[PDB]
Amino acid sequence: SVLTKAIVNADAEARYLSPGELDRIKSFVASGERRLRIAQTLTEARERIVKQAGDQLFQKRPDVVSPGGNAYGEKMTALCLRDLDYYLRLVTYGIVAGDVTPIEEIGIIGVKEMYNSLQTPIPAVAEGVRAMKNVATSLLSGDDAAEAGFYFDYLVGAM
Amino acid sequence: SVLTKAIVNADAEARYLSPGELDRIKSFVASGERRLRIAQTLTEARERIVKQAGDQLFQKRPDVVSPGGNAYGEKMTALCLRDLDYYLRLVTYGIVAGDVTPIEEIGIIGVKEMYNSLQTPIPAVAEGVRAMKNVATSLLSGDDAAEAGFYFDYLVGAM
Amino acid sequence: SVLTKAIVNADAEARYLSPGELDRIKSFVASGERRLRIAQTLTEARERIVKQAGDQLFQKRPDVVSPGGNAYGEKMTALCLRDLDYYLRLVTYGIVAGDVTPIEEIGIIGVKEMYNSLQTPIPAVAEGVRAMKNVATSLLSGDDAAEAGFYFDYLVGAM
Amino acid sequence: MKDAISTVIAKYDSQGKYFDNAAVDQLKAYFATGELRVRSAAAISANAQSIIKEATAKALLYSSLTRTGGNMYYARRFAACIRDMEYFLRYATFAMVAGDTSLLDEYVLNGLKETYTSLGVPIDATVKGINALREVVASVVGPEAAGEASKYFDHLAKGL
Amino acid sequence: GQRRIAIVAKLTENAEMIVSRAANRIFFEPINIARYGPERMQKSIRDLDWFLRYTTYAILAGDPSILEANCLGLREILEKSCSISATIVALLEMRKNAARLFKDEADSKLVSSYISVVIRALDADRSDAPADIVRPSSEDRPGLTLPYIYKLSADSLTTFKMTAIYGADGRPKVNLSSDEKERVVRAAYRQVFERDLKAYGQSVSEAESKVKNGEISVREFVRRLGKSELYRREFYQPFINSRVLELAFKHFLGRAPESRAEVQKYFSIISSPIVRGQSSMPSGGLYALIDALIDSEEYTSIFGEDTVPYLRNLGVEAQPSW
Amino acid sequence: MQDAITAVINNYDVQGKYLDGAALDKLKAYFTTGAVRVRAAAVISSNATTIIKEAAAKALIYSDLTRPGGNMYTTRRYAACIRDMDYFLRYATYAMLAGDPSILDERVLNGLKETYNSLGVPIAATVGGIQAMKEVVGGLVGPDAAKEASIYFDYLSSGLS
Amino acid sequence: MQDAITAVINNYDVQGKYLDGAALDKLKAYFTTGAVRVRAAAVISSNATTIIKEAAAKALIYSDLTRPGGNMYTTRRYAACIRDMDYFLRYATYAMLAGDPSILDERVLNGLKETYNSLGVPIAATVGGIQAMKEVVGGLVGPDAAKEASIYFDYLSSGLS
Amino acid sequence: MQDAITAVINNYDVQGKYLDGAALDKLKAYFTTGAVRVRAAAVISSNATTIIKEAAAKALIYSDLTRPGGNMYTTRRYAACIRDMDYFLRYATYAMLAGDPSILDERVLNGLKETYNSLGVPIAATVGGIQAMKEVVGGLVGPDAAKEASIYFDYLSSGLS
Amino acid sequence: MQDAITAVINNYDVQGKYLDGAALDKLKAYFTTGAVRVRAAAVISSNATTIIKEAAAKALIYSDLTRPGGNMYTTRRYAACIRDMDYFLRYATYAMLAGDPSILDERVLNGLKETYNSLGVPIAATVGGIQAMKEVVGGLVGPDAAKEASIYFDYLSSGLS
Numbered sequence A, B, C: 001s002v003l004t005k006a007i008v009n010a011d012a013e014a015r016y017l018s019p020g021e022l023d024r025i026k027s028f029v030a031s032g033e034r035r036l037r038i039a040q041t042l043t044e045a046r047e048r049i050v051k052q053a054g055d056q057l058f059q060k061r062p063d064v065v066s067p068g069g070n071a072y073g074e075k076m077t078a079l080c081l082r083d084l085d086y087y088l089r090l091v092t093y094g095i096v097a098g099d100v101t102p103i104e105e106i107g108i109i110g111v112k113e114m115y116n117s118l119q120t121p122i123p124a125v126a127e128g129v130r131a132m133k134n135v136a137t138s139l140l141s142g143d144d145a146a147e148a149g150f151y152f153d154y155l156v157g158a159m
Numbered sequence D: 001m002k003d004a005i006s007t008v009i010a011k012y013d014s015q016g017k018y019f020d021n022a023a024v025d026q027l028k029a030y031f032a033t034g035e036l037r038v039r040s041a042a043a044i045s046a047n048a049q050s051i052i053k054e055a056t057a058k059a060l061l062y063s064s065l066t067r068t069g070g071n072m073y074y075a076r077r078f079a080a081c082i083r084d085m086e087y088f089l090r091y092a093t094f095a096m097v098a099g100d101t102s103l104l105d106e107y108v109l110n111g112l113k114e115t116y117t118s119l120g121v122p123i124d125a126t127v128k129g130i131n132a133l134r135e136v137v138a139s140v141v142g143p144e145a146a147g148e149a150s151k152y153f154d155h156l157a158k159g160l
Numbered sequence E: 001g002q003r004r005i006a007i008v009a010k011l012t013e014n015a016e017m018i019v020s021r022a023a024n025r026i027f028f029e030p031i032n033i034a035r036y037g038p039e040r041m042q043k044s045i046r047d048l049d050w051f052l053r054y055t056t057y058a059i060l061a062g063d064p065s066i067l068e069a070n071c072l073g074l075r076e077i078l079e080k081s082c083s084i085s086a087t088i089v090a091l092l093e094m095r096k097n098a099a100r101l102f103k104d105e106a107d108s109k110l111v112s113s114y115i116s117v118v119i120r121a122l123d124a125d126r127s128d129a130p131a132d133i134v135r136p137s138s139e140d141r142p143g144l145t146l147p148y149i150y151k152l153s154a155d156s157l158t159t160f161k162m163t164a165i166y167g168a169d170g171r172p173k174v175n176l177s178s179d180e181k182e183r184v185v186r187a188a189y190r191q192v193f194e195r196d197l198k199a200y201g202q203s204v205s206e207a208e209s210k211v212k213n214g215e216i217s218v219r220e221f222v223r224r225l226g227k228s229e230l231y232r233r234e235f236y237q238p239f240i241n242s243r244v245l246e247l248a249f250k251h252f253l254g255r256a257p258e259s260r261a262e263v264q265k266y267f268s269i270i271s272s273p274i275v276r277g278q279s280s281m282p283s284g285g286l287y288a289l290i291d292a293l294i295d296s297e298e299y300t301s302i303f304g305e306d307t308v309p310y311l312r313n314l315g316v317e318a319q320p321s322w
Numbered sequence F, G, H, I: 001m002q003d004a005i006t007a008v009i010n011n012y013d014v015q016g017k018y019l020d021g022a023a024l025d026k027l028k029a030y031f032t033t034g035a036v037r038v039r040a041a042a043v044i045s046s047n048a049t050t051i052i053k054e055a056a057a058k059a060l061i062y063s064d065l066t067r068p069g070g071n072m073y074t075t076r077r078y079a080a081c082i083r084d085m086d087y088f089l090r091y092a093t094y095a096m097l098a099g100d101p102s103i104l105d106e107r108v109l110n111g112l113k114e115t116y117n118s119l120g121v122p123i124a125a126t127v128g129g130i131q132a133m134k135e136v137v138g139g140l141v142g143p144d145a146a147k148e149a150s151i152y153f154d155y156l157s158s159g160l161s
Ligand SMILES: *[C@H](C)[C@H]1/C(=C/c2[nH]c(/C=C3N=C(/C=C4\NC(=O)C(CC)=C4C)C(C)=C\3CCC(=O)O)c(CCC(=O)O)c2C)NC(=O)[C@@H]1C
Pocket: B064, B069, B070, B071, B076, B077, B079, B080, B081, B083, B084, B086, B106, B107, B118, B119, B120, B121, B124, B125, B128, G060, G061, G062, G063, G066, G067, G072, G073, G074, G075, G078
């Protein structure tokens, strides 16, 4: 969360929280209620977001759902969708936290290694996240969408 | 405390708390407010109780505060009074707990051994506690005094 | 040793050494110098004691050094003599210690099992020790011999 | 063990302090709550057997565990899990009375993950079963005492 | 086993039919397919196959127990969910199936005996089936309860006990086969010293003599071992006092030390300088420790005077997590 | 470390559950308390030097400790003791903002007893100092903030003792 | 355990050597020292309670430890600490009679550090108490005995630290 | 522990599958070998003392181990070593009846390494003894039985090393 | 580390004995096995990534561990577990070439149990994974090689458990 990040920087510097840092915390607590609503919206639309994004991804990448491809077959396709769902849940957590750190520890560290063992293509996963972003953006109001976009972009950058 | 004792018996039997046991808990919680007042009274009068009891003890036992005696000298006399204060604090803890167990762990186990190393006479210590009881009784109302007396008596019995 | 035994009993009882126990220790330390001389005598005569005892044993038991018997053959006869030497060394250790415990740990525990696997007859081994005792007794003065005899007897009893 | 009364005592003796009003306030609070906690405990004891069964149904039952190659599978395994759910309930009730979390971890939380990992029991499922016990309990208990009762359940859940 | 394999193979190939007839029979009171609903029906179909698959296993195994454990609790679980009768009626069909499949009377019979076990539990009431003991504790170590089926699944525990028999003489004399008497002693030696002490070839002469005669109890024998010279030096003398009380737990009571308060009570016993004792048998000290354990109610109750202590373990008495 | 917001998140993540209204309510509760906490933290930071001074004056100084043969005797030791006091204060402030005692366990509390015993620093005196700081802090922060501040100070004290 | 006499024997036994004059001389040395040791042991046993009292007065009592929040605070803990002191004294006496430090290693020293660390008992303070006992013991036993007594006390101290 | 029959059953039970004929054939194979195994076990039990004696003669005795300063020097140690040899033999016989190596892992192999390292018992020498026992056993049991017997002996040896 | 050839040499060196025919026979035995081992090692190295994948598929994945609240849940933990798997495979391959289990003890086995217990990693599941790797490896290497490969895998498993 924002507060954890601020504390950690202070501890490294071995100083009390700076006034500026404190001000940012104040802003965050005010923003939180709005953030909660944004997260709630995405949670309700979660099932549809995943479904729509999946379809887009498969259209964008025929290969992944092909006999050679990792995603091919019902079991595999379900797992690919489950992964998309996981990332969406992480994004919601991020929005409420106001930081990517929660997202980062659960999803972005060791992700390359995990997927390489699985043999899943990382770029395709990124495309799926991008697809989810577009669906999510449409349901969200513009300013809400921008907030959500940042977290989505981070995920795409990470993979 | 009463509640701990009841829970412990239940756990030994590996059963949920019996109705009778539950009733005793109910009685204790009702009594607690009265108990708190009794404890509060003694705490406020603590300084005077100790002082009065000390004087009585020293009158009763000239020897302890004599060149041969352990209590003799300012430093030693202070320590003797500190001990009396400790026991009073323990008694207050007991009243709120409704059990002697709190008193017992802090003050009554190994007491013989400690005092024997110090060479302090145990009977004199007991007299001091008795003296404190008499002072405490006077300040307390009769029913309150009876409750307080039980805890005081236990201490005297223990030493 | 005598002292070790006394200490061990005290530790089990969790008490300081009893006066009686202390007295026995005192007696032992006085005796020690005499004991050292007795041990020294046997050590010097060791080679001859073993040789003489061996011959006596073989006369007493023709069978052991017979084609059927375990002792038969040069290699085997040497081993039998080596065993006798071992037991003599143990006896000397015992005399200085004033206790059979040193002897017992090295030689008497599991001895039956070891010899049974080897198939060596235990009674013949005992006879050899008895033979060694007789030789040793002759070289020792009477009172010295009695002391030495006790340790020799213990060995014979053990096997 | 430690309960809310004795906890306050224990913090004061280490400081060597006589009881202050601040401490007396915490003690008063326990005594106010206590009367209904006794009521809520009795409710939970009576309906315990039912509470467990409902909870199992919501999460444990109709899961992969029930299917062969899961822990629930077999009557023997099924029975064990129920015992564990009964354990979680008695303690949570014991914790509700007393009003101190610690009773929980001395008797339950300490060592649990290590046994479960050794037996092969899945930690997550148990956590779900505990959360289920919480919802059932809350209804039986009623709204005022539910907040109280929910705390001890949540402690167990985060411990695992 | 070889023919049992053949029997299993026959049962396996006709299994689907065997299930069907039992199912068709019931799908006493007869219950319609539809009111039950698909899931409950699906469960019932699974259950039939389940009994049968265990039966095949039970044949191969050659033990009633596998079927025994699973059937017990199952009858309790079923009832609100299921009619008890329908399950029964099912075996009527399958035992008839069993008789038909295997022409050898004995082959059909053994298959029947496995099916009989399943039925016999179902027949037995929920009340008739017995709940397993719950290990009791005083003010520390919460009381834990174990399920019986769990206890049944676990391999049976061999108990070595020798019981003193009263005589017309009035001096107790105990009757055992030459091997059987001394076998208790062999295991006692083995429990306390954690290894058999015969391979070293020392053991207390007078201890064991008295138990063979039967005047001092086995409980009193294990007492005599702990006090013995052999028991220290092997244990006690090489350890620090805090470690000795932990090993002395394991061999004397079969559990590990379960709480902070007990390891404290016992640490004060072994620590405490003895009150002077007239009995030349050294007073208390570590002997106090050993007394306190045998004299403990937990000891006496669980083991009794006859039994030699056994190691309680995963299978028995539950076993705590902390 | 952990904070209240992250604690809620972590509990949900182990369940795998998406955030729900009940969870949201807990988060909302924290957000209301947050404003008070931030004000308290700013007060403490500004008065940190004084808080330490006052607390030392109340317990540590003018005592045997400062006199020769005492643990806080010599400039080096004196400076160390006040540095330790500052640590406790800073971490308690961090904990108060976080709303969680975990940071205290992870940084301050872990291995402190052992360190102190090797050093020969007196634990009870240190605890006394922490309690003194709490009292001073309580005044400055004001009553609503004081309750929140006190729990973290007490947590430190209990850990050390 | 082991004693000086047995130690010599054991060294020879591993070599397989019969006892020799050099070995005998070491044994003889022990025998002369023995009488002194026995006298010292009797002195210590009679004055054990006082020795502990004096040592506690020198180091433990009138300290943070005895004050609330200190390790030796409460009667139960006080009693435990003096019990431990007695253990050290008794074992040191045993070692002095034996003429060998081994018993200390086998009973007292092994696992004590770890136990104390888990308990949070302060090792350095305990060592201080042992050193204090040594000083008191030295007086009572007298000079010849004191040197012998001191080595075992020092051995305990080094082990704990 | 586990046996061959149960191992197959357990694998099938997790799958939920009724036993395949191929699986049944493996079980059938075991049942035929079982008669031969029982005969082998009886041979070993009767000749156990001799087997140990011969194996010791081949490796352990007439060696540095038995000579002073060697691990098997002194009667007590000699007796211990032959007791261990008997254990290995008995457990291998149990394993042969079972048709499964698991019992060896559960009872013999678990904690053995640690015990030996603390004792200072030499593992390689022990392994040598096990191999020697295997050779002696092979003769007595006869060829068909020997192959079965050998695998369990080898399993023990591999575990220790 | 040590190998088979060096192990023989070391045993002789402590004895001070020149190499003898019996020793030579052990060396000769190793030399025959050697060629097979080299082929097996090359197979394992080429298929290492797949071996790990298959073993994970058999035991670790599609399980509670991978599901939220499981030890291998989260990318970080998943990556850690597969890293550990790779370690075990590499070391087992080294051991197979060497013909000695010692390297496993010196590198992998020492302190692993303690590390895992602190981490809260489940040992039984890890053991399961090792056994799975063994099965996959057995197929690729072929039967003669498999027997040799299996012992090292079993050694790792026994150590962990
Ligand atoms: C007064 C009634 C009697 C008396 C008292 C006395 N006490 C001491 C010294 C100490 N007494 C204690 C006692 C306690 N510490 C605890 O933890 C508890 C329970 C909470 C008690 C009761 C302690 C620890 C000491 C040791 C010194 C210290 O504070 O560190 C003395 C002086 C000791 C001395 O002999 O020098 C005295 C005199 N003596 C009497 O004769 C009175 C009857």
